[PDB]
């Protein structure tokens, strides 16, 4: 229904790493030098441009935010949203009679149902749908890999900043202004890199893949329902395949009625 | 991708100077040679010609050779299948010509005379596989160079540090020499994660993009030699574009 | 041959031979023991003799194989099929052991007998598999030594750090331990990514070239048995030839 | 094979003892126990008893139980072929014995029985695969312990550094404390790459060698099952040996 683990996890990780700053004097502005911000964040972002052209690096907050939003209600409702269609198309008319499949929810069900009203061989439908899922999973893998690659570049430039801070520190041996603000750069570059990489990017990079998996299973059960409608089956026999996709606790979650 | 280099260097140069320090200490010309020459030397040891000369033909395709794919492939194939449907049958080369990118023509010139789906499929898979291998090898070479760059930067750091214990007096120099001796690994790691590792991943990303495009082209050509029409073939082909391109294509 | 081993060590020497005109300080006898002795000894632990003895009979047997280029083999197959055709018969042949180095003889000395070709394919492709596996094992040995070298450089780094520590009361033991820590890892770095990891990866590309050459010889020896003319055999054999050499061979 | 273990410690110990200081500082009974007991404990967490106890009963096979193969498998197969073919029959059990070492008879007792070449192939290949898997398991168990050793060495290093800081007088204890702290990670790193990872790769290499040997057996067991010309069989058998051995066997 509502993936509640990532919103609580983000606030937990960041609240802890933020209370860490304000527990030794409470001053929070000493963890912000503008140089280290450039070296780490701008460095990794520019290497991300070198890697990804601005055209499909623009799909960052598109095929990442479409997953992170996930406002689609198609979680368990798919079952009854298919049994009612089968009931209204079976003994309540004929298959070439749209109920709401030109105004219903997220496009995949819409797409398949627009396909099943017009005469199409089931093999063709199966191939297009599987080929429509695999490409979805490939776009999700591309986005997740884009995230993990940035998670990799961030501590790389953390190391680079550590080297900058050591070079410009050893260079000016005693100035009372380069020992500090030269060690500050070395430390804060590493801090931003090692915080960014495994708090924002590597977790959320790995997170995109499980959302891709659950959406793939959802699309698989949707495909099975569409082929069931195309073949023509009673809702009684329909459940023998659709219910065998959820989790065992999720199985009984709806069978109360 | 050519904007990214000047940006990744300008941002780190701004970071190296925002303290107000003199960037004069981040420059010695010998260390540039140690790092880059050693990396490219070990690269010559590592990789032979006929395979070092194929890194260039692909690193000269990520900056150039811009096609028209991912929105025009669908248009082209839907209009051919409209032609292949009872008006302009499979023996019509008028539309196949003038559309030669490198690949769509390769299959559209071989579908017209005679082939079997289980043969065009195989030769197309082999072509995509060799194209994937070319990019994989170029990316592996660039990643290996990003590996030998900080390795030889470390080597140069050690070269600069070893000749410092001999002249071990005590004033300011045990620090100045550690400074000017650490520049070599700085250049090493900086080149590694600013030029080579990003470009190494760039080759892999472009290989994925071109694999998706060539699979779209393959599916299209296989759909031409099937006797299919739009609203089925279009539905099939369209299931490769990002959902952004599905709304930016449905409006056209 | 682009193996620029002279270049990396030349750049190191040019780095080593800086203002400290005496490079006798880049030689610590203890550091040699730790790094090289420990690496070689863990190589004996890993690879026992009669196997580690092959460090100079594959690694050395591949770096002097410039006695037969992949065009010479085409011309040899050409003029052997010349006398295998109408002019002469496939009964008497002595050009096998005329100016061939080690291979193409086992295939020829076998096909001149009256046996089936299927087993010939089965044995020759088997030889190619075993040869690639042998080269893979040699290159894996070279990479494993490049893995143990910097590991023992780190070991020596810890050794020199501990030995320098707790007795910072003079200028003899601290100097010895400092030099140990520095040059122990200097040897390991200068060794791994300049002699072993380059040459570990390099030995696999020689293996690929020899594998392609051997598949070519295999196709040739199978064409000798069958009744094919060199004209119609050339195109069946030239398929494995290098792309840039196809035009370079057509000069004839 | 154990001759390398004494060398891999004596060489580094000489390097540790290059007239710098007593090795009494390099030894601390606390840190030894932290490192080794911690790695052993994490190994007990990883592998339980009756499965970590099976380690030593496979690793001891690497120190003994040598093989006669690579020169003698070929001879003991060609003479068996010459004795079965042309003489009596393949069911000659009189001479099939007297050389029952480990594995040749595993299939030779079956070819004299009524089977098909596929089922014997499947039993032999299954045996080879499970041998490789058991060796992979042992090698994994050794590399994993080589990984835990320096991890717990660093754990002990951190322990020593914590209880050194805020526990000292800040005058001269900083150095000696760091020495006796890093002793732990020295022990961990040394034990890892001197004992375990070399032994893990030794298990892997031995699995490779015995796998080639068992494939060499099976290819030839199937030949005896078919009763083929010993010439062809001598040729396919010898096509497994290093070029020095392909000749060294030739004069025998």
């Amino acid at each position: 229904k509502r993936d509640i683990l990532t919103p609580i996890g983000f606030v937990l990780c960041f609240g802890l790493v933020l209370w860490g700053m304000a527990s030794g004097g409470s001053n929070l502005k000493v963890f912000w030098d503008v140089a280290s911000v450039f070296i780490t964040i701008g460095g990794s972002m520019a290497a991300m441009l070198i890697t990804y052209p601005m055209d499909e690096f623009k799909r960052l907050l598109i095929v990442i935010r479409q997953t992170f939003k996930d406002n689609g209600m198609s979680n368990i409702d798919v079952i009854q949203n298919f049994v009612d269609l089968s009931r209204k198309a079976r003994r309540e008319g004929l298959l070439s009679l749209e109920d709401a499949i030109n105004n219903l929810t997220d496009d995949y069900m819409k797409k398949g149902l627009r396909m099943v009203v017009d005469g199409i061989e089931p093999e063709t439908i199966r191939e297009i749908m599987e080929l429509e899922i695999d490409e979805m999973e490939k776009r999700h893998k591309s986005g997740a890999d884009m995230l993990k690659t940035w998670g990799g570049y961030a501590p790389a430039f953390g190391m680079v900043g550590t080297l900058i801070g050591l070079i410009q520190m050893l260079a000016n041996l005693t100035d009372s202004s380069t020992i500090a603000s030269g060690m500050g750069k070395a430390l804060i570059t590493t801090f931003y890199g090692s915080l960014m990489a495994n708090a924002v990017f590597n977790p959320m990079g790995a997170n995109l893949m499980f959302k891709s998996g659950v959406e793939a299973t959802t699309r698989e059960m949707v495909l099975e329902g569409v082929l069931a409608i195309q073949s023509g089956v009673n809702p009684r026999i329909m459940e023998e395949k659709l219910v065998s996709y959820l989790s065992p606790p999720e199985r009984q979650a709806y069978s109360k009625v | 991708t050519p904007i990214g280099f000047v940006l990744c260097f300008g941002l780190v140069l701004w970071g190296m100077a925002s303290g107000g320090s003199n960037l004069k200490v981040f420059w010695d010309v010998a260390s540039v040679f140690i790092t880059i020459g050693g990396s490219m030397a070990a690269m010559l040891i590592t990789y032979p010609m006929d395979e070092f000369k194929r890194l260039l033909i692909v690193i000269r395709q990520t900056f150039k050779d811009n096609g028209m794919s991912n929105i025009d492939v669908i248009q082209n194939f839907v209009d051919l299948s409209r032609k292949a449907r009872r008006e302009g049958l499979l023996s019509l080369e008028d539309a196949i010509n003038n559309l030669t990118d490198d690949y769509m023509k390769k299959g559209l010139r071989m579908v017209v005379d005679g082939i079997e789906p289980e043969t065009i499929r195989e030769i197309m898979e082999l072509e995509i596989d060799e194209m994937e291998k070319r990019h994989k090898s170029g990316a592996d070479m660039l990643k290996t160079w990003g590996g030998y760059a900080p390795a030889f930067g470390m080597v140069g750091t050690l070269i600069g540090l070893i000749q410092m214990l001999a002249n071990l007096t005590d004033s300011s120099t045990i620090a100045s020499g550690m400074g000017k001796a650490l520049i070599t690994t700085f250049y090493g790691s900086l080149m590694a994660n600013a030029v080579f590792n990003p470009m190494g991943a760039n080759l892999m990303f472009k290989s994925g993009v071109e694999a998706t495009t060539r699979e779209m082209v393959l599916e299209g050509v296989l759909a031409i030699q099937s006797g299919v029409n739009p609203r089925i073939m279009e539905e099939k082909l369209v299931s490769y574009l990002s959902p952004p391109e599905r709304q930016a294509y449905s409006k056209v | 041959t682009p193996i620029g081993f002279v270049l990396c060590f030349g750049l190191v020497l040019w780095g080593m031979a800086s203002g400290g005109s005496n490079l006798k300080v880049f030689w610590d006898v203890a550091s040699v023991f730790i790094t090289i002795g420990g690496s070689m000894a863990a190589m004996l632990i890993t690879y026992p003799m009669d196997e580690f003895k092959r460090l100079l009979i594959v690694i050395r047997q591949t770096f002097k194989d410039n006695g037969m280029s992949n065009i010479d083999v085409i011309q040899n197959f050409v003029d052997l099929s010349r006398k295998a055709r109408r002019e002469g018969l496939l009964s008497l042949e002595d050009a096998i052991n005329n100016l061939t180095d080690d291979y193409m003889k086992k295939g020829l000395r076998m096909v001149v007998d009256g046996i089936e070709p299927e087993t010939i394919r089965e044995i020759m492709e088997l030889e190619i598999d075993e040869m690639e596996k042998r080269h893979k094992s040699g290159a894996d040995m070279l990479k494993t030594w490049g893995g143990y070298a910097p590991a023992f450089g780190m070991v020596g780094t810890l050794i020199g750090l501990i030995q320098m520590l707790a007795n910072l009361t003079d200028s003899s033991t601290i100097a010895s331990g400092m030099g140990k820590a520095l040059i122990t890892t200097f040897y390991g770095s200068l060794m791994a990514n300049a002699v072993f990891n380059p040459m570990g990866a390099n030995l696999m590309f020689k293996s690929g070239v020899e594998a392609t050459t051997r598949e070519m010889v295999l196709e040739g020896v199978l064409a000798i048995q069958s009744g094919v003319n060199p004209r119609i055999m050339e195109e069946k054999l030239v398929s494995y030839l290098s792309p840039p050499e196809r035009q370079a061979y057509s000069k004839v | 094979t154990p001759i390398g273990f004494v060398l891999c410690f004596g060489l580094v110990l000489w390097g540790m003892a290059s007239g710098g200081s007593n090795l009494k500082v390099f030894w601390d009974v606390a840190s030894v126990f932290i490192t080794i007991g911690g790695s052993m404990a994490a190994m007990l967490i990883t592998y339980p008893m009756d499965e970590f106890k099976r380690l030593l009963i496979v690793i001891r096979q690497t120190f003994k139980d040598n093989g006669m193969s690579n020169i003698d498998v070929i001879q003991n197969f060609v003479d068996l072929s010459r004795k079965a073919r042309r003489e009596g029959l393949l069911s000659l059990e009189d001479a099939i014995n007297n050389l029952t070492d480990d594995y040749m008879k595993k299939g030779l007792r079956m070819v004299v029985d009524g089977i098909e070449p596929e089922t014997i192939r499947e039993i032999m290949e299954l045996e080879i695969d499970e041998m490789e898997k058991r060796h992979k398991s042992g090698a994994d168990m050794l590399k994993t312990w080589g990984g835990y050793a320096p991890a717990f060495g660093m754990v002990g290093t951190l322990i020593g550094l914590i209880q050194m800081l805020a526990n000292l007088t800040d005058s001269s204890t900083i150095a000696s404390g760091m020495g006796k702290a890093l002793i732990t990670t020295f022990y961990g790193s040394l034990m890892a790459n001197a004992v375990f990872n070399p032994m893990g790769a030794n298990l892997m290499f031995k699995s490779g060698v015995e796998a080639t040997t068992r494939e060499m057996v099976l290819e030839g067991v199937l030949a005896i099952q078919s009763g083929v010309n010993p010439r062809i069989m001598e040729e396919k058998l010898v096509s497994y040996l290093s070029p020095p051995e392909r000749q060294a066997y030739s004069k025998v």
Binding site: - | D170, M178 | A181 | -
Partner: peptide, 29 residues
């Protein structure tokens, strides 16, 4: 490669900088 494999010799040379700083620490001046 993995883009991280020099972190071994990186740690080596960082340890060596630490050793030089130890060398700057037997006298502190």
């Amino acid at each position: 490669i993995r883009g991280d494999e020099w972190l071994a010799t990186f740690s080596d040379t960082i340890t060596l900088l630490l050793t030089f700083f130890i060398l700057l620490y037997s006298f502190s001046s």
